[PDB]
Design a protein around this nucleic acid. Structure first.
Ligand SMILES: [Mg+2]
Ligand SMILES: [Mg+2]
Ligand SMILES: [Mg+2]
Ligand SMILES: [Mg+2]
Ligand SMILES: [Mg+2]
Ligand SMILES: [Mg+2]
Ligand SMILES: [Mg+2]
Ligand SMILES: [Mg+2]
Ligand SMILES: [Mg+2]
Ligand SMILES: [Mg+2]
Ligand SMILES: [Mg+2]
Ligand SMILES: [Mg+2]
Ligand SMILES: [Mg+2]
Ligand SMILES: [Mg+2]
Ligand SMILES: [Mg+2]
Ligand SMILES: [Mg+2]
Ligand SMILES: [Mg+2]
Ligand SMILES: [Mg+2]
Ligand SMILES: [Mg+2]
Ligand SMILES: [Mg+2]
Ligand SMILES: [Mg+2]
Ligand SMILES: [Mg+2]
Ligand SMILES: [Mg+2]
Ligand SMILES: [Mg+2]
Ligand SMILES: [Mg+2]
Ligand SMILES: [Mg+2]
Ligand SMILES: [Mg+2]
Lengths: 24, 248, 214
RNA sequence: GUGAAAUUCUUGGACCGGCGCAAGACGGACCAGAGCGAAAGCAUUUGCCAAGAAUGUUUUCAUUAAUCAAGAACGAAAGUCGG
RNA sequence: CAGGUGGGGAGUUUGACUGGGGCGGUACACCUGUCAAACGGUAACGCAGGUGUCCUAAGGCGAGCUCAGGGAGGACAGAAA
RNA sequence: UUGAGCUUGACUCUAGUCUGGCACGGUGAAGAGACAUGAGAACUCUGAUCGUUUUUUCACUGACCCGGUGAGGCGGGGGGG
RNA sequence: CGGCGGGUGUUGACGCGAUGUGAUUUCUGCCCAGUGCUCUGAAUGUCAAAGUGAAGAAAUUCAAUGAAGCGCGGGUAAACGGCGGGAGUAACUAUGACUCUCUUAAGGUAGCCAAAUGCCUCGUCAUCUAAUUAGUGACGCGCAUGAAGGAUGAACGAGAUU
RNA sequence: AAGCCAGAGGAAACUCUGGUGGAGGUCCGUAGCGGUCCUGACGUGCAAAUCGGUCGUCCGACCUGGGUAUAGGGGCGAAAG
RNA sequence: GUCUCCGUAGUGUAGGGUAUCACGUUCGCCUAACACGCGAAAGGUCCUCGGUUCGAAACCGGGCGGAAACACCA
């Protein structure tokens, strides 16, 4: 991928991870 | 089958304004020879808080031009005026904050505080706190002045209408959140019986068009025509549009 | 169905006495019908006409507006409204490696005409100059702008619009501006680039008729 | 309007031309391997307000300096909040 | 005075039968066969169905023919011309 | 074939509202026509005068309406500057 | 009931009046076909009384004209409200990223869930118990979740539950 | 809670510590006001709605006397017809 | 249970006088080849049976299925 889009994908995944952890 | 709230407000019985501690009608001085041809000087003797309104009122004392007496007025305080200040009212008054002079004599960009709707009544426009009108344009022929009101509308008035120079005091009163039902109660207790407002959907069908149902829903379009009978025109009255106001 | 040009009748457009060619040309308007007056239709028209076809042997890059105030008989009669340089002349004057100074001033004549004047000047390189560019420093530019703003007001405030127009016909104002500025930085292409009417005084018909006739 | 079209606007006068009015943006050409600023950045006129480099100096103080963990100010655009 | 709008308000109505009522159905006006007990009559929300039409002829008269089906034959022709 | 509370796309109305007409309800012009004496040519078609006819536009004030005031200097003119 | 009567109003858009949602945080997706509301009358179709013209002896009849409204045309969903099917398809099976069509005004987005909303149902898995139609966590083709209300989040509650 | 004093640390920006102060539709809890649960008592009662214990709130949208105003398809309603 | 609707190429669908559209399938082009594209072709007891009609996929009854909607007050 383009590095910028890998960065964007990582940011989306990190928001999802934060939401999952906050749910606990 | 029951008269609704809002219909009951016109009879006035419980819904008359609470005017017990109000300090008087806030008005310019009546136009006379001094206003019409020169100026008359008064002194701001006090600035007071009128219950029910957010604008301070200015108690100004003038000299009676025809008999030995002192005339006290209750101007609406333009912001920046202070006690012990001289304010001048008439055609030959100068542009200063608090002076009263006809709009036709004012330049093409000045802004004004207590504007007259008709040439000779006292102030009627831009009276609420923080508000002002703007003198846009003149034409010496037909003696007309075009002004911009706080609502953004444009109005043509006579050039002989008087107004106070400046913005009315009381600042950005609506900026502070009320934060409390108690503060709202104390706010409206000084104004009138209107505050604790029950939603119509929470009522029964007998006292509201929107009342009733097993779920709290309106059940009919909330926009209502202009010529609807009283007891029916509740909701968005003659609305040209609904929604979110995206763009203007 | 019938062509509307059957109901059009022609009028002759007349320039003031400042120009020795009085015939601007011809215009047309629909004949009077009902409340619609051909006089009202003809009034308020602007005729962007060059200077070479208004004055006998003047330059061609200068245009005059010549708005119509009053029509009598078959003659529309015009009066000064503004002037402008032409697009090609203005674009040819702008060149690289030189500084142009632009000034504007609002000034009232003796007879109540308010004018906005726009003047341009361009830095001139000397004949023996080896350096490519001819740039004036900012203080020199400010002094030149101030000079050419204060020697446009004294040619307008102290005289009538008639002898303002007849002296901006040869651009005497630009010539004296250029002569004055030589002690600060030399200038070569100095013109009153534009003038526009801002306000007019009440349209005295006697004044219009003395502008046209005598 | 496009490669071509179409969505769209049009005998209700659209586009075009003329004269006005209003609003909010934007400061062309001049504009450069030019300037200034710690960088980010900075271009309509005029005025006010402090600031600054370089230069000039047979002025003054006399080592008061250089770089700098921690800490501090500013920091395009996008984004967020209130008007 | 006229037209529009007008549950804001007024007055009123919101069929019947029915193995309770409602939903369903129409057994609510008719016609055929049966029920039906060899005169006639005879019931269920009994059974099997049909009707709110169609026809200047599909009405009227006269004349002349014979229908469905099958068998046997006949160029194309065949299960059917 | 008794009601009442409430709703509405039931039936029949109704307060209020929107709109047209008539009356209060006038005075001048300017348009465009139908106006009415008329005039050009039963001999074949055009310019006018005052009233009237509509419809529009503009203006006036005197009916009518609003605001201010203890109805306190309004309009025109003459001084004097 | 009525008077140019009265309330808001001793008021003037930072104000009155009418609604919906309901602190904060974070979001508030698509649909103007329907029903409403509203804007524009443009040649405009329909359109009462009065008024105009004609026929008649008159009653009367006919015709022309064309107010609002309705039609015609735009806007609007933090207006009422609404937000789909049927097949095939990946080198074990299984699902279906993907592909076809039918159709809508748009086909339910972000989220959330057997939830106070899930029939089937005591759903399936995990945890809690010796044993749980209960509780919690998770899953989701969800009979019939869902965005001015969705999802959260401290503090609080004579609220419901383990 | 803000405001204030002192000490200490900092180059500054400011920070830390101890006091002071006394805010709040703040907490516990009298009187008052209310009325959760026992589904207690009583239920031909003390009472045509009361009593006991337990409870909610208790500086505020607080409690309350008197004087006024609003009247029946009307009033008034922080909304339960 | 009651009421209503549907059954058409392999697929999703249109429709009383010789069954349409699109995809799919076949063949030939183009390409080194596949796909795309281009030119042609094939394909359907119109669910089953009976009836009306000169003639039924249609119209009308019966049956096979499939799909919706009701299935309430005690
Ligand atoms: Mg509310
Ligand atoms: Mg309720
Ligand atoms: Mg109602
Ligand atoms: Mg309701
Ligand atoms: Mg609904
Ligand atoms: Mg930025
Ligand atoms: Mg913002
Ligand atoms: Mg009723
Ligand atoms: Mg017998
Ligand atoms: Mg018998
Ligand atoms: Mg016979
Ligand atoms: Mg009976
Ligand atoms: Mg009844
Ligand atoms: Mg109806
Ligand atoms: Mg609210
Ligand atoms: Mg109409
Ligand atoms: Mg929209
Ligand atoms: Mg979902
Ligand atoms: Mg679920
Ligand atoms: Mg549950
Ligand atoms: Mg247990
Ligand atoms: Mg769970
Ligand atoms: Mg939404
Ligand atoms: Mg408390
Ligand atoms: Mg407490
Ligand atoms: Mg008990
Ligand atoms: Mg109830």
């Amino acid at each position: 991928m383009r590095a910028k889009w890998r960065k964007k994908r990582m940011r989306r995944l990190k928001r999802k991870r934060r939401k999952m952890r906050q749910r606990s | 089958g029951r008269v609704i709230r809002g219909q009951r407000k016109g009879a006035g019985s419980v819904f008359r304004a609470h005017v017990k501690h109000r300090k008087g009608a806030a008005r310019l001085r009546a136009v006379d020879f001094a206003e019409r041809h020169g100026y008359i000087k008064g002194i701001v003797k006090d600035i007071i808080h009128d219950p029910g309104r957010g604008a301070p009122l200015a108690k100004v004392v003038f000299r009676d031009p025809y008999r030995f007496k002192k005339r006290t007025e209750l101007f609406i305080a333009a912001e920046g005026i202070h006690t012990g200040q001289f304010v001048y009212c008439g055609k030959k008054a100068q542009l200063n904050i608090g002076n009263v002079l006809p709009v036709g004599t004012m330049p093409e960009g000045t802004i004004v505080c207590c504007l007259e709707e008709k040439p000779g009544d006292r102030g009627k426009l831009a009276r609420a706190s923080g508000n002002y009108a703007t003198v846009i344009s003149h034409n010496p022929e037909t003696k007309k002045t075009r002004v911009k009101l706080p609502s953004g509308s444009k109005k043509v008035i006579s050039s002989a209408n008087r107004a106070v120079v400046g913005v009315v005091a009381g600042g950005g009163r609506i900026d502070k959140p009320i934060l409390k039902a108690g503060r709202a109660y104390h706010k409206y207790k000084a104004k009138r019986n209107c505050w604790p407002r029950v939603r119509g959907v929470a009522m029964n069908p007998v006292e509201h068009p929107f009342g009733g149902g097993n779920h709290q829903h309106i059940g009919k379009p909330s926009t209502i025509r202009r010529d609807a009978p009283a007891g029916r025109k509740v909701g968005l009255i003659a609305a040209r549009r609904t929604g979110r106001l995206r763009g203007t | 169905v019938v062509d509307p040009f059957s109901k059009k009748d022609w009028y002759d457009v007349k320039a003031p006495a400042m120009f020795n060619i009085r015939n601007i040309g011809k215009t047309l308007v629909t004949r009077t019908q009902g409340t619609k007056i051909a006089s009202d239709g003809l009034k308020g028209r602007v005729f962007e006409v060059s200077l070479a076809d208004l004055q006998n042997d003047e330059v061609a890059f200068r245009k005059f507006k010549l708005i119509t105030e009053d029509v009598q008989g078959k003659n529309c009669l015009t009066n000064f409204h503004g002037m402008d340089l032409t697009r090609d002349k203005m674009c040819s004057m702008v060149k690289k490696w030189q500084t142009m100074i632009e000034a504007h001033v609002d000034v009232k004549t003796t007879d109540g005409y308010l004018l906005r004047l726009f003047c341009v000047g361009f830095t001139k390189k000397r004949n023996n100059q080896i350096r490519k560019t001819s740039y004036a420093q900012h203080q020199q530019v400010r002094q030149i702008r101030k000079k050419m703003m204060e020697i446009m007001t004294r040619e307008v405030q102290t005289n009538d619009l008639k002898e303002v127009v007849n002296k901006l016909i040869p651009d005497s104002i630009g010539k004296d501006i250029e002569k004055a500025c030589q002690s600060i930085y030399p200038l070569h292409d100095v013109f009153v680039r534009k003038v526009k009417m801002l306000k007019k005084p009440k349209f005295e018909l006697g004044k219009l008729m003395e502008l046209h006739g005598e």
